Amino acid sequence: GQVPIANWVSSATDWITSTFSSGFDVIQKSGTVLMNGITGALTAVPFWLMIAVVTILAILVSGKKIAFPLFTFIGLSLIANQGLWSDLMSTITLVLLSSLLSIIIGVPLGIWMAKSDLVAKIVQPILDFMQTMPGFVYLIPAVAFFGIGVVPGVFASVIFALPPTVRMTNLGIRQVSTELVEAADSFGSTARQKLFKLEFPLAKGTIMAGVNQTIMLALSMVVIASMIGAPGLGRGVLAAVQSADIGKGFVSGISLVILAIIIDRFTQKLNV
Amino acid sequence: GQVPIANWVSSATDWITSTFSSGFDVIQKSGTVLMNGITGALTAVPFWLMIAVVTILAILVSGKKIAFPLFTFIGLSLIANQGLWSDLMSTITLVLLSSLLSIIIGVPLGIWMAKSDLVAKIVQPILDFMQTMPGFVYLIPAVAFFGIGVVPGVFASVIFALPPTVRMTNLGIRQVSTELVEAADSFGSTARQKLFKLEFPLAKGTIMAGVNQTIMLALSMVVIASMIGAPGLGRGVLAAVQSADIGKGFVSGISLVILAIIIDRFTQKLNV
Amino acid sequence: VKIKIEHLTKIFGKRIKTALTMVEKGEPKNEILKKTGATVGVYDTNFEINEGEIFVIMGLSGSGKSTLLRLLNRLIEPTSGKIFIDNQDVATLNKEDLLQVRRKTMSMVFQNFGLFPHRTILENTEYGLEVQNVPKEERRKRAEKALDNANLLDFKDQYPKQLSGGMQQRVGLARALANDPEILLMDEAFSALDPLIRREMQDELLELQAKFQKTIIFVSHDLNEALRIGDRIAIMKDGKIMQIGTGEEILTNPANDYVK
Amino acid sequence: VKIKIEHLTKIFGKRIKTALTMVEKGEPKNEILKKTGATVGVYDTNFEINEGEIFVIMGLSGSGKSTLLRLLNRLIEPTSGKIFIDNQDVATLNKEDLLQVRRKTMSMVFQNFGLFPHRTILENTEYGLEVQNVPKEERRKRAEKALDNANLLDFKDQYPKQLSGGMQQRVGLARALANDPEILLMDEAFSALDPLIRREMQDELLELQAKFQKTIIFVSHDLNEALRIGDRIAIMKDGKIMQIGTGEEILTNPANDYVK
């Protein structure tokens, strides 16, 4: 019998989290301050003025259909009445930050994969490797480095939601018809004027689909990270399934469902 | 302030789990016996004869490529050496039962959705409603009825993995060219000879893609259900992220990753 | 006579009774299919088909030529009408009687050969019997004789994808014939073959009919091939039959220049 | 002179140096086209283009016809050869030098019009300047004058999807001109047009060329348009130039009898 790995892994992780603590403490500070800043100040404001804004925005993107606005109003207001508005402001900053980081990390990586073909041959199977595996195993590399808290949930989310963004970015870049690229290269476009002026404005519609997948994946992953300590509605759910208080768990789950439907309909209608 | 729901929900759930206990006790018995039967007898046999079988099967489905067989051997054997073979036999019976139930429930429902068009107009958006929402909220309806254990993990998995099976079944049925259906109906095929003789043999290749998604979704969901008490490697992972023992958690996560890669490559190569 | 039609009608879309009666005024279908949007397949066709003949059916591609066929065996539910055969009306039958009809009496042949690619020749050709719960040996022998009557028993284990358009059509016809039907429906059977193999299949069909007599219904778009097959030709346009002429169709030209 | 070529060639596939020494020798082409697949695009072309003329180029598929243009631009990296222009070899230029070359001297026109559909015409036409970081007002007025020279300034706010092939090509040519280059490249500019607008654009092109003098190199299939417009025609096949005949190519025809 041999069981050598665990020791090697814990040793390497201690070495990292000891020799790089200069970075991890900074990341922890930044994460906690961003969270408690854009969840209490940029949000957590009158819960009858935000649901109204969202209702009229749904009206805009819907035109005449009143189902989705009725849901937004008889939704978010339902949450508030149930007293879960402060746990929805969180669970939004989390998906917000996770989506922003996944974007910042994928879109560039998507460009790099579109230019070089060997980079794609490398990463695309890696992306299927990361989108096939269960996401619950993205928590180890989170609590191992950042321990429990918010930033580990964010890390798990960005590394769980990244693949689709990268894939659809690569697509939307290396699916724009080569003739336009010839045109933009004939007038001397140095891959930075070309990108913004031609490729993004044409890929947008493909990329944003990857991003509207990224957002849902980040929501799923933060709800799962609730196990770690990532605040929001997930914790509620968690508590319930730990104490079998189906009322609290169900209301939190229905709040998450409402948030999910809203985000889906928005992120879809704002893509076409 | 009003907070009425939780009480209504807990009341309804008590009413169900009290007036139907005749069924829930039976389901619990059946689930526990199936699990401890096909995880200890149909499996949990020499851990050097099963990895060899799987290695040669990988060789078959691979032909000349030796990477995937080398992985199976230097995988499963790795698990065994780490002492996690009894937690992999479980986490397999679970995905096995979840996939079987999801199939039994979807494939028929997929047929019903292919025949009637209103049924599809109903369910397809419901299926996107169930495939967009986070899966963590499929635990409430599990611990509320079956409490903690194995059968709740199975329930969460079957209701989390069902959508793709149903969708791809509907597709593979109402994408077989109408001319063959005319041919089979002209000779008097009463929707049961027609189905088996024509539609399934032609849809197979589309359905099985939905099923190879179902399997991965069930794996993800049982790993997540580890929170409830669904045994297997998930529990390990869980314990780790609860006690920050990154060694055990990492070895269990790598075992899950290995199982996932194996299942993906198999379920893919056995579809083409 | 083996077949007798009585006021066959097929109309798509909603406004079933309203549109049916509004068109029953007898107005040109163009108006109602263009402005009122109610699509029309046929309108009150009352003809017949006697045993041991060939009632070809013409019509420009898009004139509701094959819909009549697909209505005869009820592959499309007809609005109103009667098809009296063997002293039996088909539109007034349950699933069981209709299935027995389709099994024993009628059987079709398709433009794109309607062949099950995942099943080999001796596997497809026997379908007409497999559906009937027939002894494997008996249905196998019947399939093999239906094949060798077409000289293809040698290929009784290949797959359709590895065969020729003409061979695929011959296999479809063997599938239709193995059931030994009193009626044989053919919808653009040779619309995807070459002229020479087309003519060859025509001659094969004629020699088989003369040898083995049985009622045939046939759709086509060429008048030459028709007259080569035509025992009682009947062209159609705007979903309305206009004549049943054997050698007079090309003589008499009632309100039609297409006849030349 | 304006252009001078020096043993220009382009070879695809690996086996780069071996295949290069193979092609430089004059070995058979179809041999390697069917043997290894390391296709051949050009055959050691050594010609030149004088200032203020129209060096049309003809050939069929696989002639490496359009490839020569994209090599002059370096849109595809040439294996070996040199293009001396304004006392500059392009193949041996750093990034910024080739950038300024493409931005001032050369500029292309495309078969399928190569237009940014997501941008307005007056937004496209100015691209040639936008890339140069030109004053918005200056480039706007230049683009408007360019549209005026083509009489399409009224449509300075529509989108290409709402226009016609002729107007699309005209806007592409305006985009090419707004840079006021010394060279004008075209690649099957009028393959998606009809004879009328084709000949009209040809006449307008010669009018501008005579009024506004500047080097042109043209790609086409038909000899009629080449003689209508071409001042020095060049035939090509299998990636090899045949001749440079203005009015002699019609006479000296080593298999150049396509005149009729």
PDB file of C-alpha atoms in Angstrom, chain B residues 179-191 193-194 196-199 201-202, chain C residues 70 75 99 102-103 106-107 110 112-116 118-119 127 130-131 175-176 179:
ATOM      1  CA  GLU B 179     -40.545  10.196 -46.202  1.00  0.00           C
ATOM      2  CA  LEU B 180     -39.458   7.175 -44.164  1.00  0.00           C
ATOM      3  CA  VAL B 181     -42.435   7.730 -41.873  1.00  0.00           C
ATOM      4  CA  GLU B 182     -44.722   7.809 -44.904  1.00  0.00           C
ATOM      5  CA  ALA B 183     -43.138   4.555 -46.049  1.00  0.00           C
ATOM      6  CA  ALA B 184     -43.604   2.871 -42.684  1.00  0.00           C
ATOM      7  CA  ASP B 185     -47.175   4.140 -42.358  1.00  0.00           C
ATOM      8  CA  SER B 186     -48.143   2.959 -45.840  1.00  0.00           C
ATOM      9  CA  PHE B 187     -47.467  -0.654 -44.824  1.00  0.00           C
ATOM     10  CA  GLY B 188     -49.501  -0.353 -41.632  1.00  0.00           C
ATOM     11  CA  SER B 189     -47.067   0.349 -38.807  1.00  0.00           C
ATOM     12  CA  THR B 190     -49.008   1.098 -35.626  1.00  0.00           C
ATOM     13  CA  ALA B 191     -46.534   3.500 -33.971  1.00  0.00           C
ATOM     14  CA  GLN B 193     -43.439  -1.345 -35.001  1.00  0.00           C
ATOM     15  CA  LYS B 194     -42.641   1.977 -36.656  1.00  0.00           C
ATOM     16  CA  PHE B 196     -38.471   0.400 -32.987  1.00  0.00           C
ATOM     17  CA  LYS B 197     -37.953  -0.539 -36.626  1.00  0.00           C
ATOM     18  CA  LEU B 198     -37.340   2.950 -38.031  1.00  0.00           C
ATOM     19  CA  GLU B 199     -37.090   5.870 -35.632  1.00  0.00           C
ATOM     20  CA  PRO B 201     -32.332   2.971 -34.992  1.00  0.00           C
ATOM     21  CA  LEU B 202     -32.058   6.296 -36.824  1.00  0.00           C
TER      22      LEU B 202
ATOM     23  CA  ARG C  70     -51.701  10.165 -49.969  1.00  0.00           C
ATOM     24  CA  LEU C  75     -51.546   9.451 -45.281  1.00  0.00           C
ATOM     25  CA  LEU C  99     -54.227  -0.823 -41.011  1.00  0.00           C
ATOM     26  CA  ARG C 102     -52.871  -0.657 -45.935  1.00  0.00           C
ATOM     27  CA  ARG C 103     -51.379  -4.069 -45.171  1.00  0.00           C
ATOM     28  CA  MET C 106     -52.783  -0.955 -51.017  1.00  0.00           C
ATOM     29  CA  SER C 107     -49.072  -0.194 -50.895  1.00  0.00           C
ATOM     30  CA  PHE C 110     -41.919   6.668 -53.406  1.00  0.00           C
ATOM     31  CA  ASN C 112     -36.776   9.060 -53.292  1.00  0.00           C
ATOM     32  CA  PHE C 113     -37.360   5.285 -52.887  1.00  0.00           C
ATOM     33  CA  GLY C 114     -38.380   5.583 -49.203  1.00  0.00           C
ATOM     34  CA  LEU C 115     -35.827   2.975 -48.132  1.00  0.00           C
ATOM     35  CA  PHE C 116     -34.582   2.216 -44.626  1.00  0.00           C
ATOM     36  CA  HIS C 118     -30.031   0.914 -41.738  1.00  0.00           C
ATOM     37  CA  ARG C 119     -31.696  -2.249 -43.094  1.00  0.00           C
ATOM     38  CA  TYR C 127     -40.791  -5.161 -43.973  1.00  0.00           C
ATOM     39  CA  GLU C 130     -42.534  -8.170 -40.751  1.00  0.00           C
ATOM     40  CA  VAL C 131     -45.210  -5.579 -40.002  1.00  0.00           C
ATOM     41  CA  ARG C 175     -41.103  -4.171 -51.019  1.00  0.00           C
ATOM     42  CA  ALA C 176     -44.431  -2.983 -52.416  1.00  0.00           C
ATOM     43  CA  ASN C 179     -47.204  -7.992 -49.811  1.00  0.00           C
TER      44      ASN C 179
END
